Structure formats: C-alpha cells, structure tokens
Amino acid sequence: GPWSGNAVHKAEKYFITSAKRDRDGKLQIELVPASGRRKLSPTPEMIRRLIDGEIEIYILTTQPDIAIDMNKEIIDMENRYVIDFDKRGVKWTMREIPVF
Amino acid sequence: PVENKNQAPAPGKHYFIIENLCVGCGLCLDKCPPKVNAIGYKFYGDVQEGGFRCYIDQAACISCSACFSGDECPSGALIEVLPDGEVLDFSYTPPERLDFDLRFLHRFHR
Amino acid sequence: LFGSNDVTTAHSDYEIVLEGGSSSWGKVKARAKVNAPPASPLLPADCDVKLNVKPLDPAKGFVRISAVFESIVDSTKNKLTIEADIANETKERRISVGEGMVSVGDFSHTFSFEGSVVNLFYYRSDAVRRNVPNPIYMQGRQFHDILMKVPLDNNDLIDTWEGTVKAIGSTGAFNDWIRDFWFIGPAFTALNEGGQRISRIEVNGLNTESGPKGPVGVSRWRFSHGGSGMVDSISRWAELFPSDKLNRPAQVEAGFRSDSQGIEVKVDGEFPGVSVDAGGGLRRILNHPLIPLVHHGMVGKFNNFNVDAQLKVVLPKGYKIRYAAPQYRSQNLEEYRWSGGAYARWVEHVCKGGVGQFEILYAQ
Amino acid sequence: DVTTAHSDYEIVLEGGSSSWGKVKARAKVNAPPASPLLPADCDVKLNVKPLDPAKGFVRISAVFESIVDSTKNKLTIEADIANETKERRISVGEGMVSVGDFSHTFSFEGSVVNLFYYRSDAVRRNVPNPIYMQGRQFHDILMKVPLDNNDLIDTWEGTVKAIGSTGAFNDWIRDFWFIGPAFTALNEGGQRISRIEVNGLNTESGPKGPVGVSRWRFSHGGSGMVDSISRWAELFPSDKLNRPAQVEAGFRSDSQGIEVKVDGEFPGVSVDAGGGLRRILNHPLIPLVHHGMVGKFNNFNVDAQLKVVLPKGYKIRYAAPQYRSQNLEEYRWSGGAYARWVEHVCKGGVGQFEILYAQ
Amino acid sequence: NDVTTAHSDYEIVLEGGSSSWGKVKARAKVNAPPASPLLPADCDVKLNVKPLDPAKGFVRISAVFESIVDSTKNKLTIEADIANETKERRISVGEGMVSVGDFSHTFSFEGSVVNLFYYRSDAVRRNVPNPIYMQGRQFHDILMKVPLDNNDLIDTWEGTVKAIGSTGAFNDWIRDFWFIGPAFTALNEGGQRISRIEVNGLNTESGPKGPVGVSRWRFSHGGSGMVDSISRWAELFPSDKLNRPAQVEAGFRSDSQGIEVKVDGEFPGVSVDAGGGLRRILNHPLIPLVHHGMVGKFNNFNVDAQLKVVLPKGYKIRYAAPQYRSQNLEEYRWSGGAYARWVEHVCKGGVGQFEILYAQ
Numbered sequence A: 001g002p003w004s005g006n007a008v009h010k011a012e013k014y015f016i017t018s019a020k021r022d023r024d025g026k027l028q029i030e031l032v033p034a035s036g037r038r039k040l041s042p043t044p045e046m047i048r049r050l051i052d053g054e055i056e057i058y059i060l061t062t063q064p065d066i067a068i069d070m071n072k073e074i075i076d077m078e079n080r081y082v083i084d085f086d087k088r089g090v091k092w093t094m095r096e097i098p099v100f
Numbered sequence B: 001p002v003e004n005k006n007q008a009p010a011p012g013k014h015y016f017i018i019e020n021l022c023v024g025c026g027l028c029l030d031k032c033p034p035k036v037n038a039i040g041y042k043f044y045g046d047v048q049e050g051g052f053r054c055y056i057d058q059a060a061c062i063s064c065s066a067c068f069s070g071d072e073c074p075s076g077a078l079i080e081v082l083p084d085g086e087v088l089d090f091s092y093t094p095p096e097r098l099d100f101d102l103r104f105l106h107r108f109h110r
Numbered sequence C: 001l002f003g004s005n006d007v008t009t010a011h012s013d014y015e016i017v018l019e020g021g022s023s024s025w026g027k028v029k030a031r032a033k034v035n036a037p038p039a040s041p042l043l044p045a046d047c048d049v050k051l052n053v054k055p056l057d058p059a060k061g062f063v064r065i066s067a068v069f070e071s072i073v074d075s076t077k078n079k080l081t082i083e084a085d086i087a088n089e090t091k092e093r094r095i096s097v098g099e100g101m102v103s104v105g106d107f108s109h110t111f112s113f114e115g116s117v118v119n120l121f122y123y124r125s126d127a128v129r130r131n132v133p134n135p136i137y138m139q140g141r142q143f144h145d146i147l148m149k150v151p152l153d154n155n156d157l158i159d160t161w162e163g164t165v166k167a168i169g170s171t172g173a174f175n176d177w178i179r180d181f182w183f184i185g186p187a188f189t190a191l192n193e194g195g196q197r198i199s200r201i202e203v204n205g206l207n208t209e210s211g212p213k214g215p216v217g218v219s220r221w222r223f224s225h226g227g228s229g230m231v232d233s234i235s236r237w238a239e240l241f242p243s244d245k246l247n248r249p250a251q252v253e254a255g256f257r258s259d260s261q262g263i264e265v266k267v268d269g270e271f272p273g274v275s276v277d278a279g280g281g282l283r284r285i286l287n288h289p290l291i292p293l294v295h296h297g298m299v300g301k302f303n304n305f306n307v308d309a310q311l312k313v314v315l316p317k318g319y320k321i322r323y324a325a326p327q328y329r330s331q332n333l334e335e336y337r338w339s340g341g342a343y344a345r346w347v348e349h350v351c352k353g354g355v356g357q358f359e360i361l362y363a364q
Numbered sequence D: 001d002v003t004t005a006h007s008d009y010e011i012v013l014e015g016g017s018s019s020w021g022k023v024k025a026r027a028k029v030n031a032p033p034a035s036p037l038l039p040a041d042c043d044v045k046l047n048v049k050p051l052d053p054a055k056g057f058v059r060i061s062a063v064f065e066s067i068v069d070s071t072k073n074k075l076t077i078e079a080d081i082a083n084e085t086k087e088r089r090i091s092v093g094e095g096m097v098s099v100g101d102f103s104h105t106f107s108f109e110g111s112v113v114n115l116f117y118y119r120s121d122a123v124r125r126n127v128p129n130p131i132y133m134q135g136r137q138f139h140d141i142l143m144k145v146p147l148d149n150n151d152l153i154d155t156w157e158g159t160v161k162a163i164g165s166t167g168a169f170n171d172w173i174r175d176f177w178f179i180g181p182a183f184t185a186l187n188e189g190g191q192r193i194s195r196i197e198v199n200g201l202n203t204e205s206g207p208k209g210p211v212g213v214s215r216w217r218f219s220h221g222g223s224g225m226v227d228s229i230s231r232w233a234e235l236f237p238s239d240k241l242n243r244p245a246q247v248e249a250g251f252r253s254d255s256q257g258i259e260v261k262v263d264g265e266f267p268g269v270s271v272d273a274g275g276g277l278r279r280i281l282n283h284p285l286i287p288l289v290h291h292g293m294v295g296k297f298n299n300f301n302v303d304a305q306l307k308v309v310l311p312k313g314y315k316i317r318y319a320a321p322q323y324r325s326q327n328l329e330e331y332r333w334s335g336g337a338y339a340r341w342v343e344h345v346c347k348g349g350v351g352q353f354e355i356l357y358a359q
Numbered sequence E: 001n002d003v004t005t006a007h008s009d010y011e012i013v014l015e016g017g018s019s020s021w022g023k024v025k026a027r028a029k030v031n032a033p034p035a036s037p038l039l040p041a042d043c044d045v046k047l048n049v050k051p052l053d054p055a056k057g058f059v060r061i062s063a064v065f066e067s068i069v070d071s072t073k074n075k076l077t078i079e080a081d082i083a084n085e086t087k088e089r090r091i092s093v094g095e096g097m098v099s100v101g102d103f104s105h106t107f108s109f110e111g112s113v114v115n116l117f118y119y120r121s122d123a124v125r126r127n128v129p130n131p132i133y134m135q136g137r138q139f140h141d142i143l144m145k146v147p148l149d150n151n152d153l154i155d156t157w158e159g160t161v162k163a164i165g166s167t168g169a170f171n172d173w174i175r176d177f178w179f180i181g182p183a184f185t186a187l188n189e190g191g192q193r194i195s196r197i198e199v200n201g202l203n204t205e206s207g208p209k210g211p212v213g214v215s216r217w218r219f220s221h222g223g224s225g226m227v228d229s230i231s232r233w234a235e236l237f238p239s240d241k242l243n244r245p246a247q248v249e250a251g252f253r254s255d256s257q258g259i260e261v262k263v264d265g266e267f268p269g270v271s272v273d274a275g276g277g278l279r280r281i282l283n284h285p286l287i288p289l290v291h292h293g294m295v296g297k298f299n300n301f302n303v304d305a306q307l308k309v310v311l312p313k314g315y316k317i318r319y320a321a322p323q324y325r326s327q328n329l330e331e332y333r334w335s336g337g338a339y340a341r342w343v344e345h346v347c348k349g350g351v352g353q354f355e356i357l358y359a360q
C-alpha cells in the first residue's frame, strides 16, 4: 500500500501546472503526478478519481495563478478554491522568493 | 573448412520547496554549497509544532540540483519544476501497484 | 550429470470443489508464484479481474455478465467495466445488449453495444460424434455483427472519429489493415500461433447521430473469426455459456501482479460449467480450452523452470474418481489430491504451452 | 523423477552401386505428449516397390493404424507415382480410411507441378549445398469417393450446398483443412497455402452407386524451409530404387511417456556433396520445426547415441562434432556435443550435422 | 561435458550532456549449436555513419557485410545517403555491390519510406509515459538500377520480366521469394505483416559500357506495435543527434562447437529522456528479441552474463530492474542473479523490460 507509489502521499499527488487563461479559458489545465513522467488533462474521469479520494490535485503558488478567480473565487484564507464548487480543494503555498 | 579471425575474451530548473509540506529539517542547507546560501530558515511559531520552514532564494540559487538529486527530503516538499512544467517530488517514485495478498491453500501459509 | 542448470522455480496450488448431483457447478481457487521475469515491455503490470454474472429472468434468458478489469501498467491506471445481457437465441446464434466504459489514466469513454454472433461449425457429421468419445478439435467460424455506439463527449473521441471517418473512405485496404491495428502487441503473432484466423471486417456504415446526451458515433461492423480447431470460442460453443446452469449468481476475483522479479496470480471463482457429462454414466472435469494453453506457450518458453504444483479436487460424496492420468498422489475418502511426479511433468508441459490431457473422470 | 530421454540411433549405409540405408531408432521419453487425446498408439508401414523403374511408376503402400482415445482408425493408401518431368509428378492410386466404425474409399489421380521460383546457375556455382531453395508446388487432385453411407451422403450434400453459397469457401477450407495446430505449423514451417480452386464437385454413376467427383487444386508454399520444394528430386529416388524399401515406424504415447520404434530401409541416404566425398542426406527442416514446436514444451536431459556403419573401404573425413568412438567400419556419436545437437533438434533446431565419408 | 553455458560481457559507455552518443562493447560465447543448416557461418558487419551535411540533414551510412558460409565468401557493401524530409517521409540515395563467390553485381537505388502511425491520439501519448506498442504502416517505394553486365544476371532479368508479365499472383509469391526460409516465419513471430508488392516499372536503358536494368517497386510493411521500424521511427534516426562519424563493427562466428560474437561501436541515441528528468537507456527493440528467441528456444543453457554501464561523471542511476550487483562509483554492474534470469528471458525471446533510469 504505502510502499507502492510515493510513500509520502496517501492519494496520488497531482500538482497543477500554470496552464491557464490564455485561450478561451484553457480548459486543458495541466495535471502532473508526483512521478511527473506523464502530463494529463482534467477530464471528467480524473474528476471521478479526485472525488473518489484515490488522487488529489493541488495548486502551486510560485507561478502565474491558475484561473485563480475563474475556477473559484472563495478567498477566505486565499486557499478555498474548488473545481465543482463542492470539492474541498487544497492549495500548496510557496512564498519562496518574496520572503526574506 | 575456412573461417575468419575472431577475438572473444568473455569465456574462461528553478527549484521550489512547499512550506505546507516542509517540516524544517534543513538537509537542503547541508546539501547547498556555503558560497551560495540559498536555503534559509523562516520562523513562524513554536518550534515543536513545526515552526520554521525553509526557503530558496531564486536569484541566489543557480541550478546546482544537489538538493533534489540527493533525494534527502522526507516530506516531499523539495519540488523541481521543468521547462515544460512537470513537477517532481522525488527523482524516481516507486510505481503504484495493485496490492492483493497471496495465500496458498495447501501450503503452510493459508 | 544433469543438464540445464540455473532454473527458476514456480509454486502453484489449485483447488476444484465440485458439486454433486445434476449440478455441474465448481469452485476453483488457484494460486501461483513464479520467479521468472514477465514478458511485459512495460513490466510493472498488476491487473485485477472481477467477472460477476447474474441470472436474469430465464423466460427469454439474457444472463447478465459484469466484467471489471483494473490494470496498473507502468504506473498507468486503466479500468474497463462492461455489463451486458447475453442470450443464446438458438444453439448457433447469440444476441447480446450491453454497456461498458474504458478509462485509461485520464481518458474515459462509455459505449453501448448490441451484437449478433452466429457460430457455425464447418461440418456436423453424425459419424464423427459416433466414432469419437470427445472431439476437442472442431473446425468452425464465428460471424460477429457488432453495433457499438460511443458518445463523443471528449475531444479525443471527436478527433479519432473524424480520423476513422476519413480512413474508411480514403482507403479500401483499411478493412485489411484494421486487423494490423486490431492486435495491439504480439497478439498478431498469437493469432497464427493459436490457429485463429481473422477475416477482413466488412463495415456496414459508421455514422454519427446527434444525441441529447452528447453526440454519438454509431459504428456497425461485421467480422469473421475462423478457427483451425483449437479455438475454444468456436469449437466449444455448446460450452462457454451456462445457458441453463445459472440458477445461482457466479463470480470470479482473479488477478495477477507482475514485476521484474516475478509473477503473482490469485484466482477465486465459481463456475457453472466445470463438469461435463460423458458416456457410460461418467462425468469429467471439462477439457482444457487450448487457446489459453497455446497463448500462454509464447511466454512460457522464455525461461527454464521447475514447478511445485498441488491440486485438490474436492469431489462430492456421491462420486468416486476414475481414469485419472496422471494418477492421484493422496487419496482422501472424498477429496483427491494430485501432486508431483507425472502431474508436475504435466504442469511443466502446459506452462510452456503443451496441449496435453489431464483426464479426470468422476462417476457414481 | 526427472525427464530423461534415451534414444538409440543407428544407420547402416551401402555404397557405390547404392545410396541405400537401413535405420533403427529406439526412443523413450518421460515427458507427457502434447495430444489433447491422451493415449495414442500408432503404427506406420510404408512399402515402396519398383513396379517399373523404366516407366518411373513406383508403388507406395502406406498403412497408418492408430488407436487414439480408445478409437481405432486405420488409413491405407496405394499409389503408383512417376515423374513425368523433373518439375511435374503424376500419381494414381486408391485407399480408404477406417476411422472407428466409419470407413470410406477414395481413388485419387493427382499431378504435382513443383516449379522453382528461380533457377540461377550463379546460385548453383557458389554456396554449393542448397538448403533454402524456394519454390511453388501446384497440386491438382481428382478424388472419386463412393457415396454409400447415408451420413456420407449427407456430408456430400452439405459440401455441395456450401459451395453453392459462401463465396469465401475456398479461403475458409484452409481453416477446415487443418484440424488443430497444423494451421500454425503452416507458418512455423514457412509454407503459405493459397485459396484452393474447386474445378468440379459432381456425382457420377458407378458400381458402388454414386461416386462423388472432387477435382481441386491448391498451392504448397515457397519459404524454402519446407523441404518438399527444396529437395524435389531428393525425396523421390525412383531411379535409385530397384528393390522393395520398407519403413515401419510406431509410437506408443501415454501420459507417462512416449516410446518410438523406427526401422527404415530406404534409398537415398547418401548424397555426394562434392567430388570424391559422400555425405549423409541433409536433414529436412520441416520435420525439425514441426516437431520442435511440440518438443519445446518440456525440459529434458538427453541420452543419445548414433551408430554409423559405412560401406567397406570408406572413412569419415569431415564432421560436425567429431565421432566419440570408432571401431573398424563403425562410428559412434555420443557424449557432449552430439547430445547438444540432439537437444537442439528436439526443440526445433535446424543446425547441421555434416557427416562426410569418402573411399 | 554435458553443461552448456553462455559467457557474455556488456559495456555501455554513455557520454555527458543531453546527447547520449554511447559506446557499446559486447562479447558473447555459447556452446550450443547454431540454428543454421549451413555451418560454419561466419560474418563481419561494419556500419559507419558520417554526417554528410547538417544543414541539409543528410547523413551517409556504409554497411559492409562480409560472411563465410560453407567455405563460401559473400560481401554486401552498401553506401547510402539517408535524409529525413518529413517526420513521416524519408528519402535515400545510394549505391552498393553484392559479391557472392565469383559473381558480383553493383546496384544503385532511390528510395522513399513513408511511415504512418494508425492512431495519432493525444490521449495515448498523454496517458502512457513510455509508448512501446505503436501500430503503423511503412510504404517503401524503391527504384533500383543494376548494370546487366553478366550473362547469368541478364538471364535473371529476362526470366523475371516474363514471370511478372505471365502470372498475376506474382505479387503474393514474391514475398515467399524475398522471405527465404525461416524469415517467412519470423515476420509472423514479430508482428510484421507484408503486403503484396506493386511493380510500378520494369524497364532497361543501356549505358555505353553495358545495359542497366531499372526496376521501380513499392511494398507496405505493416507493424502491429511490436515492430521496431514503425513504433520507434523517431528513435530510429537520430540524425539531429549525430555530429561525429559514428561506427560499429559486429562479427559472429558459428562453428557447431559454439558461437562467438563481438560487437564494438559508438553511436548516438543510446539514452533518451523518458520524462520526469531521468534519462532512460533506450527500450529494447522487440523484433530482435523475438527473432533471436526463435533460435534461442532450441536449447537450454546456463547463464553467465555481465553488463557494465559506464555512466558519465555526475550522473547516478535512480532505477534498475533488476538491481545492479556492484558499483564502481561510476560504473554500474549487473552480474548474475535476476539479471541472469533476464538474460535467459531475452535469449529465449522474452520482451521484458530492463529500465535503466539515470539522471544528474
């Protein structure tokens, strides 16, 4: 179980690259697993996996913010973004360079 | 009859760190050359509750890749972005496997 | 002294629990651990196969099968789920209506299919069935008329559909070269190595229809699967389909895990067609289909191995074993266990693809 | 225990005036057979008598008495065969099958035109020993089968109905033609058989009632691995035949093992590879591959010996792995390398064993 | 005396940087008899590639097959210019000479190979990180000219003229002629299906010193994914990666006692970026594996194999399957164990993968 795949992640960690908001919304939002060999698209089957809990997609910070107000605009702590508006999504924070 | 000659001796970059995932162990600091000093501790609160994390100064950090190639991160916060944009928690993650156990009926493990 | 050293080892266990009376039901539990490397170009391949089946109302038949394949290959997750009602219209024809879905990694597509399979032996001679006790080889041919409809919700489906529409009209050799596409891997080799021949498909006209639940590509095509005689899908049409034996639901939870150091196979199953009645009041475990053996022969001859194989036929109290060649090693009052010696030789024979017989005849 | 195959081989050669040879082979292997029907006890007797060598017509009598799954089936053929030309052969004969209780007679008149794809003197001059010679064989066979049994009549009616419909019947008769893995053996041996051409399916009056007339043609392939096209003149030593030649080969196969007994006195065992050298006939490759597909199925240790008795005054000069023992006039191949070659050919190896003997 | 063992040494010296440009040194010896009715069978093959012009993209390849079989010497030399016009269509212009015994014929050829994959789905390439089984079709169109300077050669051309003009089934039997012997089996064991050819032209124009027979013909190779030529067409031709004249010598000698093989040479394309930042030593082409298994199944053998992958400094192997036994801090060594089982696997025709992933 844990030894299969990356041992840190309970669910498959799918980071979201900065594919965004450059051509009719850029529906081909780039989802990349922790393995990183493949580069998938956000098809409804990936959403089925994500709601199944087997995978979990995460937004990074140090990049052009990915449709940050067009995907979802809940900004209570700036990290309340959800895809199907009832997702309970989690954002990865990186104040890498802006902090001392 | 005739054959040709043979010889055969065989026989006889822009690395980032996710502070949400980072736990503040600082092996990146040990893996960084002292002349650069890219890895640095940032303190948030009580040390025993996670407290300080680590950060990279992008301008100072110039494509050494020692941190990630060392593969010393326990938390997987040390990430590498690629020119095409893929992100790597680890250099080589083990493959995901469909796990289900084996029990022979007549063997002693049944 | 001995030759062919440095052999690997395969440890295998099998159990066939038969059911007494007119019920030909069996419970097959098999385990295998092989230390030989697999023949997978994408080696880390683990597949779990859940084949459920349920008796729908037998007024018209239409037993319902439900197959779920989940395969992780090179850390690529694939899942195929098919639920289909299948019914033997007559002894030669079969008609099915079903739905299903594939899902590889990210791309998934659902299909709704109907299918008329007309299976005809190249000959039905009274003399043959009069003279032979059990014809294992039987020449014949299947004709599948398959109408499959797929909503083109994904853009990949749309591009592929446009490509296929252009191809079927631009090239008449498509009907041939589609066979080249039809075998994804070494299946083209296994086709001729298994005795199967596949005729050029005859398209009846694939067309798109505007569906409220997404546009649907509806493709109707017929293809002919001829058999040299080794093919279970043709020669054993009477079998392969528990038309009246499904008085109870049945299941299979098979699976394997294959990686650079080994293969791990676990099969649990309940099958209604394990036992076949024979002449003289004898009943036997069904003759092994030869397509499995031959198709396994391609990969079974890649390493030299020694097999430690056990098999337990839990025979019903009302039956006594007969005509067992190889013979049984351990004799219980009702159970019968084959292991070692000649049976081990047979296991090594069929692991490499040898189509040999393991006649086990049980009777009252 | 362990699968160990013991094979005792011996060949005795006449020389000078004859290319004849007497062969005895006793094989016993513990591996199970690859027959879906387990017990198979078959005996084969082939007797070729020179009816007339001047005419070229030699009479081959072939009886195959087999017991498979407690079913006794006996095939028999008698055929006068003659080379009309070096490319075309003509056969006229009669036979019958005796499968179980069913039995049917057939009278066959056939012509086989074995044409080479290419015949180049450049190829003939260099690379002298021709093995992979490709060619096409056009077989045209007319079969007369008396329709007596009502099941037989039903079969005849079924086939004449199947030829009325089923425009692709010629291609699918190939799938019917080969009961089991023989369709795979087509490709394994390299032969590709084309769609047959049925010149005529008809009935004809006769003393035994109607006789089904079946004239049909087909084409045996041209890879070159198959030896029917590569050695067209070698397989048929009509000129070298002057006495009856007899081969009795029988195998008894139980799940416990296979026991083979072969006793064959035949012409054509010695062929002159070059000037002053006589060679044992080169191994046909189609049997090697067709039996290798079966022999690959089980690991085995090998105990093999080969005894060669030459014509008096001849000695072995060149040899694939040399003879293990040599008595005067007797050579014995055994030990390591010969066992390696035997294990090679059991599993389908087409490697050579070039035994050259000279006066 | 009864033991048959295979002794093999392998050395893969990769070079630093994005370009692989690796050197392969392989020695092999096996006591099993060869699967060749003509023995002894000796062969020397020299393949040297030279960058003719980087701006034009033209590369030049010379292959010299020298062989001795049954005390007969055959030599196929061929110099060719390969040029990638498009990612599907590729052109070739070359000249060569086949000398068998006293006979010798020179040939020239213009040739276009158009390789088209059946499925160009973005879904498959998006999901599968390592595409192995890629179906497709290669259309070859070859115009080959040979001086008819020999009477036997003239006879061959004349007989072929009549053969083409007489039989309409010639396009099927020409495959039997071309696939001489076990080759016709191998194409079925490797997923290769060959369509009937089409003879566009068959004519003769005469040069002042002798006649020239010109034959233009097309054929269609068809790969069911297992074929290296189709599935790895891009990995086939690393012309962009080639700036230095690369070359490989390969000689195998086959007496009935044993087979001895030596393959020494450098060439690009050994390692490709598999994604995820790890360079992968290229996947094994499966056609060699199955075609060699065809003859390797014929006998059993003990395995004594040793592979020595020489990484360039600064790079480490992150994945090996099976694992490396020993490491010299730059050289990773696979000797015995599951690597021996994998060597047995591939010798007998196994298509199992050996994932060598290495990175900075």
Ligand code: BCL
Pocket: C010, C011, C012, C032, C033, C034, C036, C037, C038, C039, C040, C045, C182, C183, C184, C185, C187, C255, C256, C258, C263, C265, C299, C300, C301, C302, C303, C304, C305, C351
């Ligand atoms: C060295 C010899 C070894 C050995 C070495 C190997 C090697 C080497 C390989 C295997 C492989 C396998 N072996 Mg093994 N194996 C040994 C002995 C065993 C034993 C045992 C001890 O009893 C068992 C239980 C097995 C069992 C298995 C399987 C787990 C596996 C093949 C899966 C298969 O069925 O796919 C079924 C596949 C298909 C049906 C093909 C699908 C593709 C084609 C294009 C489509 C076909 C038609 C389609 C399905 C029709 C659908 C529609 C119809 C309506 C139904 N082997 C011996 C001792 N084994 C192989 C494996 O899978 O590796 C990962 C493999 O590579």
Ligand code: BCL
Pocket: C051, C052, C053, C065, C066, C067, C082, C084, C086, C094, C095, C096, C098, C113, C114, C115, C116, C117, C144, C145, C146, C225, C233, C234, C240, C250, C251, C252, C270, C271
């Ligand atoms: C595999 C060898 C033959 C073959 C032989 C058969 C046979 C035999 C049958 C069909 C049937 C069907 N075939 Mg088919 N068919 C093949 C190739 C194909 C291909 C293709 C690969 O392109 C397609 C699209 C089809 C299409 C179809 C459908 C029209 C139809 C119903 C499918 C369905 O219910 O599956 C559902 C999917 C499965 C259940 C997946 C698993 C398949 C395996 C083979 C089942 C093994 C059973 C196991 C040993 C015992 C299970 C016990 C459990 C308790 C259930 N065939 C090849 C040529 N085909 C059926 C029919 O006639 O319908 C009218 C039928 O009876």
Ligand code: BCL
Pocket: C028, C030, C049, C051, C053, C063, C064, C065, C069, C086, C232, C233, C236, C239, C240, C241, C242, C243, C246, C250, C252, C254, C267, C269, C271, C272, C273, C274, C286, C287, C288, C289, C292
């Ligand atoms: C669409 C496919 C076809 C079909 C194709 C075949 C073929 C072909 C064969 C059978 C065989 C059998 N099938 Mg069926 N069969 C169909 C319909 C059915 C139904 C049903 C009412 O739906 C049932 C319950 C059965 C039940 C059975 C048994 C009578 C018999 C196996 C007995 C044995 O001991 O198995 C014990 C077997 C197991 C322990 C192994 C099971 C292995 C795996 C799980 C299934 C086989 C396929 C392949 C290896 C794996 C998946 C590959 C792809 C992902 C599809 N069939 C459908 C319509 N079936 C086999 C038999 O022996 O025929 C005489 C056989 O070869």
Ligand code: BCL
Pocket: C354, D005, D007, D026, D027, D028, D029, D031, D032, D033, D034, D035, D040, D177, D178, D179, D180, D182, D251, D253, D258, D260, D291, D294, D295, D296, D297, D298, D299, D300, D346
């Ligand atoms: C594991 C390795 C084992 C081994 C494994 C096996 C196995 C396993 C089997 C055999 C089988 C056989 N083996 Mg063995 N065998 C070993 C060692 C040997 C040795 C030896 C070293 O001395 C010998 C001589 C043999 C010899 C034999 C044969 C007696 C037998 C196959 C009969 C045959 O000719 O059918 C030839 C039959 C054909 C030609 C039939 C063709 C059918 C088709 C449909 C008809 C097409 C048309 C027809 C050809 C046309 C002819 C036209 C006329 C020319 C006019 N084995 C090694 C050590 N062997 C088989 C056996 O005995 O079966 C019961 C078998 O399954």
Ligand code: BCL
Pocket: D046, D047, D048, D060, D061, D062, D077, D078, D079, D081, D089, D090, D091, D093, D108, D109, D110, D111, D112, D139, D141, D220, D228, D235, D236, D245, D246, D247, D265, D266
């Ligand atoms: C085997 C490869 C080829 C083949 C190659 C040849 C060759 C070569 C010859 C024929 C010949 C004949 N072929 Mg044919 N033929 C094949 C398959 C067929 C089939 C079929 C059902 O597939 C048919 C209908 C025929 C029809 C016929 C007949 C018209 C004719 C005489 C047969 C005979 O007397 O057999 C009787 C059968 C027996 C004697 C048993 C034969 C066993 C083996 C194959 C040969 C004997 C040698 C044996 C190894 C050692 C014994 C030595 C003894 C002294 C004989 N062939 C396949 C496709 N055929 C002959 C001819 O040209 O006729 C005009 C001929 O010379």
Ligand code: BCL
Pocket: E047, E048, E049, E061, E062, E063, E078, E080, E081, E082, E083, E090, E091, E092, E094, E110, E111, E112, E113, E140, E141, E142, E178, E221, E229, E236, E237, E246, E247, E248, E266, E267
């Ligand atoms: C081998 C499997 C396929 C095949 C696949 C390919 C591939 C792959 C290529 C060609 C190409 C060519 N093909 Mg082709 N082709 C085959 C059969 C044929 C036949 C025939 C009747 O047998 C003919 C006439 C041709 C004709 C031709 C030419 C038009 C052209 C250049 C040949 C040349 O320079 O060779 C010179 C001779 C050789 C170099 C001899 C050795 C060949 C082997 C295959 C090389 C392997 C290299 C080794 C693994 C690594 C070497 C490192 C070295 C440093 C280079 N092909 C079969 C069916 N064909 C090329 C092209 O597209 O041209 C436009 C090309 O890329």
Ligand code: BCL
Pocket: C040, C041, C042, C045, C046, C047, C069, C070, C071, C072, C073, C078, C079, C080, C082, C100, C102, C103, C104, C111, C113, C115, C146, C148, C181, C182, C183, C184, E119, E124, E128, E130, E131, E132, E133, E134
């Ligand atoms: C032991 C072998 C491994 C394995 C090893 C490999 C290897 C190695 C390769 C692939 C490749 C592929 N495999 Mg895989 N893969 C396995 C299991 C699966 C399963 C699954 C059971 O869930 C699926 C869906 C797939 C799917 C795929 C694709 C991602 C890809 C081929 C693309 C293509 O052109 O296909 C087209 C395929 C078809 C034309 C064949 C026909 C499809 C099926 C059989 C049709 C019948 C379906 C159904 C049962 C019928 C009834 C319903 C009908 C609607 C009537 N694999 C098993 C476990 N796979 C290749 C790759 O990625 O290529 C880039 C590759 O190199």
Ligand code: BCL
Pocket: E024, E045, E046, E047, E049, E059, E060, E061, E082, E228, E229, E232, E235, E236, E237, E238, E239, E242, E246, E248, E249, E250, E263, E267, E268, E269, E270, E282, E283, E284, E285
């Ligand atoms: C005319 C031939 C074709 C062609 C056909 C093929 C085929 C087919 C294959 C390769 C393969 C390879 N080729 Mg190439 N290739 C062509 C052009 C080139 C050029 C170039 C710029 O000219 C270069 C540098 C290469 C380089 C390469 C490598 C990237 C790769 C082998 C990797 C390895 O480690 O091999 C290890 C090295 C070897 C084992 C050395 C082999 C040396 C011998 C002398 C050549 C092979 C002989 C073969 C077995 C028999 C041929 C007999 C025929 C009758 C001619 N190719 C030309 C245009 N090449 C393989 C690969 O993986 O492709 C992706 C592959 O499958």
Ligand code: SF4
Pocket: B015, B031, B032, B033, B036, B037, B038, B039, B056, B060, B061, B062, B063, B064, B065, B066, B067, B068
């Ligand atoms: S990449 Fe180099 S500079 Fe940047 S943190 Fe690592 S060691 Fe320091």
Ligand code: SF4
Pocket: B017, B022, B023, B024, B025, B026, B027, B028, B054, B072, B073, B074, B075, B076, B077, B078
């Ligand atoms: S190694 Fe990982 S946990 Fe430790 S300081 Fe670096 S990023 Fe944080």
